[PDB]
Amino acid sequence: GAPPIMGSSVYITVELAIAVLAILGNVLVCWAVWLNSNLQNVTNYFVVSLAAADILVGVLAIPFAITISTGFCAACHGCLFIACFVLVLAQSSIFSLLAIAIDRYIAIAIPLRYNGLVTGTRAAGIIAICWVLSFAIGLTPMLGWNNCGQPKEGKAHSQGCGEGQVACLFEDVVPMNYMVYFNFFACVLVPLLLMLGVYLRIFAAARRQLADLEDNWETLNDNLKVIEKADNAAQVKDALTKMRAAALDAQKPEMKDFRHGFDILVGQIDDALKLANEGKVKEAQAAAEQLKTTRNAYIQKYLERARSTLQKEVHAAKSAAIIAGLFALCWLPLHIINCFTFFCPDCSHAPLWLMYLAIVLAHTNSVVNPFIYAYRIREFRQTFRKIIRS
Template identity: 45%
Template sequence: ALQTPTNYFLVSLAAADVAVGLFAIPFAITISLGFCTDFYSCLFLACFVLVLTQSSIFSLLAVAVDRYLAILVPLRYKSLVTGTRARRVIAVLWVLAFGIGLTPFLGWNSKDSATNCTEPWGGTMNESCCLVKCLFENVVPMSYMVYFNFFGCVLPPLLIMLVIYIKIFMVACRQLQRTELMDHSRTILQREIHAAKSLAMIVGIFAVCWLPVHAINCVTLFHPVQAKEKPKWAMNMAILLSHANSVVNPIVYAYRNRDFRYTFHKLISRYVLCQTDVFKSGNGQAGAQPALDMGL
């Protein structure tokens, strides 16, 4: 069934990916044009994508811990990781993601140094109402992006996930080498390894897609002279790659998961193709759903 703790975390990740497609990408395009607006409106556009990125990282971390417990303590897993606890964890993680992403609103921003537009609001010269050129780097300081966002909130979870998946494969391989494992237990363990492989791939894809942006941010902060010489297309390509992550993720965690694939096919057949009996067996009974499998 789809209503498992692991799938709750995957749905949380999917929600972040969908929100990136619907909101973050248009916002990113908007704040790359340099149009004139008030400072905090521009800051909100810039921070919203940070919220979604952080929620993706937390969802990936939650899935990694979930799979680690499934491999390490399989007999106690169902009592430790319940649907209710998973939903509570997801709620806490999203609150934390909003807190981290919206931190610039608390004062860690570039309001004092933002480049103002030549046309003040309403044609007056009131400085408090003056518009700013809406660019990401004009409202969010690189110190926040590097020290707090990258070193504090992105890199540590990625390193933790790397350690977790290494330990998962080490523990799983040791258990598979035990000759006394029953065939049923061995099959379940192999399925967990396949699931871990798919989820580790998601983490790897996330790192490949997002590390270039953070690397450029680090160069901008620590080597400002060299950063001025970098071609504009480099940053644009890095941003494009980061948003492409939200397109790649569903292919891995949805299409590779039999439960998701079965459900998608069922929904399309029933509501798009209007076929109500496509998933019924020859005796007219509905076919059984396949077991959870995220194997590659």
């Protein structure tokens, strides 16, 4: 058995490196949102809350994890707090990630009433509530669901702990049924599955809306061909009645030129419709040919800006789903190991070095979020450069 301080020195040094990187990167995230007003929206208010929890990981959780790895003597309820405070920050992260996904779903499913529904003041109240719930969930062991009533008295005396103290070890004080049933299944796994379902609805909604923009555009062009090769006044009326419905369906600085374009489009369809109802088929086809001018000058531009906006919303949702996916990737090994500890008492406990590896991997998550915003969000990246240069 090698001396514990050799392996502990590597673990501590890595933990301190992660703490420094988590603090620096996420203080930069908060600084960027504080200065740049283009970054000041509801989505980024949860981003800041998410970054604040990552800051507290390096300031408190990582020093707590270094402390509780030594198994020092402590009063059980005080030992419970340094054991469970990281569960509060992990819970806070989950609420912020679920809020970001829900916020993006509202922006893409009901964009007309997004600003009136999702406001900045309601977001700050939600964030306050989620932090209160995160403390209550994460510090539930301090409410009585703990093993302080049955202290390992042999381990406490072997380390010279005083009366009323225990050897502060996570799996000694935190019950494993809490970690698996309450923390993992109820408070971690179910919300992550809810995020997955929200993102699936987001990408399904975007794909359908792009589909609708391509259908109405093709409906417009196909009915134009029908009018050209028609032979009576009834075929022209049938095609124009479809375009007028598709134009009004599609109508539902640049907002003034696009409203003018659809006023021309629907108006010209009406001109050709009246000429068709009068039996003037040749005059109706010529009036419908003026629609091509309106299409190339106004309607084709609306379809490309609407296509561009939806593509930006997909990219933004993909970036947010990457954040929530890496969170699961970084925390699931720790939760899976707890499942083996709890559900298989005949299996040997996962080796200590694998425990150290899982703990470090979970802490690393507090570093990766500032890199995703830099590589995937131009507004964050450009603000990051201006902060670092200045």
